């Protein structure tokens, strides 16, 4: 706002949440703007590799950043993720080959891993209260929904009204503004190793109560990851829908996520996080089961709403529970426990398009949806074990 407000105020912890939200929003906007422009060895191999590069590289780089945050601190990885994201945006703006696009996607994956892991660990470290941690984590998770909701129209408007490189140049400018905001809250020039050494990643992966939450997130997000690309193909084949209907059919699934992540961050602590996740998994299963029973565009409005709402419920309930569990049963170091959560998010986006296409070609879209729904419903009862884990 006004320079007077900037120069005369106590820097609150809400600035860290704002930084995390902005970084996640810009990351998702960059991820979503590129997709309409990608078509511009075998072409089937090239397209699949280009689609899976970002998620695969982020998945590979998550644990290293998790250990790095403990070794040196959060702000330096946050700033590094910033710099890598800006370089990736510039490379997208000024490239025309295929190898350069692949390199840009890989760099974006590295930067996204850094930003997500470091920011979520930082938020967990500065917000040790369960209720406030849940609230801030829901607010931060709303950034993904905001980005995936704003990206496509922004890219489409800037593509034909100004030029091809205009969306990327504008996004790079927004990134520069984000870094300008970042430079006034952090000190990305000093190494600040944490006081206590966290538990080994192998020890955390042997904890049943962490694996359950990670599997909840993974199985919840895999359904949307496999449904997002497969739905337009089925709609074109069956409903003979037009070009804009393909875009607008999936709009409720993003609006409902945006609503749910913001609203349930508060209600999860009141109603029981285990119960919230259980109900979210059941609702995702039922909605995905009901998706292939629609014959018109109007039949896809309610199931998509349910899918998005319940995925938001699951994410906002099981995001703070990782920090809660590591506090309850392990050492209160959050760098390496949110790497597991990020890997759970990234697995579905990595293996979504390829597996979804293979299964849809093999048995069909309705059978794929039925499989996803049955898997989610069967996994839902496992959340009962998170209501009262044994203490340390």
């Amino acid at each position, epitope marked *: 706002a006004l320079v007077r407000w900037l120069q005369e105020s106590r820097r609150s912890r809400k600035l860290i949440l704002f930084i995390v939200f902005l970084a996640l929003l810009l990351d998702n906007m960059l991820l979503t703007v590129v997709v309409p422009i990608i078509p511009s060895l075998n072409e089937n191999v090239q397209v699949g590799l280009l689609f899976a590069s970002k998620a695969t590289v982020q998945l590979i780089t998550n644990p290293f950043i998790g250990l790095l945050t403990n070794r040196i601190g959060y702000p330096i990885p946050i700033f590094a993720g910033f710099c890598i994201m800006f370089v990736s945006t510039i490379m997208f703006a000024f490239s025309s080959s295929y190898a350069f696009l692949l390199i840009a996607r890989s760099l974006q994956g590295i930067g996204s891993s850094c930003s997500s892991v470091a920011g979520m660990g930082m938020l967990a470290s500065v917000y040790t209260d369960d209720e*406030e941690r849940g609230n801030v984590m829901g607010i931060a998770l709303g950034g993904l929904a905001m980005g995936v909701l704003v990206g496509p129209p922004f890219g489409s408007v800037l593509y034909e009204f100004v030029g091809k490189t205009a969306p990327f140049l504008v996004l790079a400018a927004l990134v520069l503004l984000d870094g300008a905001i970042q430079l006034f809250v952090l000190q990305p020039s000093r190494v600040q190793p944490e006081s206590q050494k966290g538990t080994p990643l192998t020890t955390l992966l042997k904890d049943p109560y962490i694996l359950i939450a990670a599997g909840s997130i993974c199985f919840a997000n895999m359904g949307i990851a496999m449904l997002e690309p497969a739905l337009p193909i089925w709609m074109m084949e069956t409903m003979c829908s037009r070009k804009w209907q393909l875009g607008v059919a999936f709009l409720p699934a993003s609006i409902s996520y945006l609503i749910g992540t913001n609203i349930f961050g508060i209600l999860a602590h009141k109603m029981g996080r285990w119960l919230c996740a259980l109900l979210g998994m059941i609702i995702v299963g039922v909605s995905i089961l009901c998706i292939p029973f629609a014959k018109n565009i109007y039949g896809l409005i309610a199931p998509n709403f349910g899918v998005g709402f319940a995925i938001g419920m699951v994410d906002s309930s099981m995001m703070p529970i990782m920090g809660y569990l590591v506090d309850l049963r392990h050492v209160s170091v959050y760098g390496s426990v949110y790497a597991i959560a990020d890997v759970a998010f990234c697995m579905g986006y990595a293996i979504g398009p390829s597996a979804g296409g293979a299964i849809a070609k093999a048995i069909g879209f309705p059978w794929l949806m039925t499989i996803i729904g049955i898997i989610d419903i069967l996994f839902a009862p496992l959340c009962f074990f998170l209501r009262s884990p044994p203490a340390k």
Partner: antibody, heavy 124, light 108 residues
Framework: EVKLQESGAELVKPGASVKLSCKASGYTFTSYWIDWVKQRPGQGLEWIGNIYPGNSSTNYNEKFKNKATLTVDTSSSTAYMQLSSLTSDDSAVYYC?????????????????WGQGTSVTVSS | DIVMTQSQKFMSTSVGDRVSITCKASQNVGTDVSWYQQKPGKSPKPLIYWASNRFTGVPDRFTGSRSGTDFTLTISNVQSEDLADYFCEQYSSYPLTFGAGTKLELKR
């Protein structure tokens, strides 16, 4: 070592101004905020104001806008608070404190170092 | 303004007992509360920051908790050097407000 030193005591006539000093040493003066607080005997603490020695930007309690004026001398690294038109109600102990940032960030978490108070008495 | 009500001015304890000091906010200050201890002949020093975190060097006896707008400072094993004044501040909204201090005293 961080140290904020204050005058031991001050004697002031009624209806006269007083200038209290707070000398800072052991750190870069222009990088941390300085807080002035008041404690009247038998009562709770009262926040008087903030000053940033770098930008010389101040924050005042609306109760103390007319009474208190905060200034900074960066050549000798001193913080001054001037009180005008003193009455018998102003007899209290005035504390000078420094705000600290969380490690690796610029967010405030506590006033880690306080200076010993200055006992101002207003008697004729 | 937000009034931080600290109920009891004087509290009597014994060496080895547990003591709890309460500070109630007025307009829903969210974990923006700090605790300070002032020894009889010294300047105040912080104990708890952000209403739950313990300052560096503070012994494990001191702990802080929040339940809505109520903040509690607990000393599990009171010692002879824990007899001092304790007060709470909130910095969620200007102006800063401090609760009236609480003094620990022995029993006999």
């Amino acid at each position: 070592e961080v140290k904020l030193q204050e005058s031991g005591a001050e004697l002031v006539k009624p209806g006269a101004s007083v200038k209290l000093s707070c000398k800072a040493s052991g750190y870069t003066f222009t990088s941390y905020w300085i807080d002035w607080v008041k404690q009247r005997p038998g009562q709770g603490l009262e926040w008087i104001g903030n000053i940033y020695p770098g930008n010389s930007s101040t924050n005042y309690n609306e109760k103390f806008k007319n009474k208190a004026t905060l200034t900074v001398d960066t050549s000798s690294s001193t913080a001054y608070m001037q009180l005008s038109s003193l009455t018998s109600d102003d007899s209290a102990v005035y504390y000078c404190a420094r705000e600290d940032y969380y490690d690796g960030t610029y967010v405030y978490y506590a006033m880690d170092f306080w200076g010993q108070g200055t006992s101002v008495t207003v008697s004729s | 303004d937000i009034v931080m009500t600290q109920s009891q001015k004087f509290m009597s304890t014994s060496v080895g007992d547990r003591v709890s000091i309460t500070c109630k906010a007025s307009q829903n200050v969210g974990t923006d509360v700090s605790w300070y201890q002032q020894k009889p002949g010294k300047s105040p020093k912080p104990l708890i920051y952000w209403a739950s975190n313990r300052f560096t060097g503070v012994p494990d006896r001191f702990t802080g908790s929040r339940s809505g707008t109520d903040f509690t400072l607990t000393i599990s094993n009171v010692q002879s050097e824990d007899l001092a004044d304790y007060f709470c501040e909130q910095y969620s909204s200007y102006p800063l407000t401090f609760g009236a201090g609480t003094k620990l005293e022995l029993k006999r």
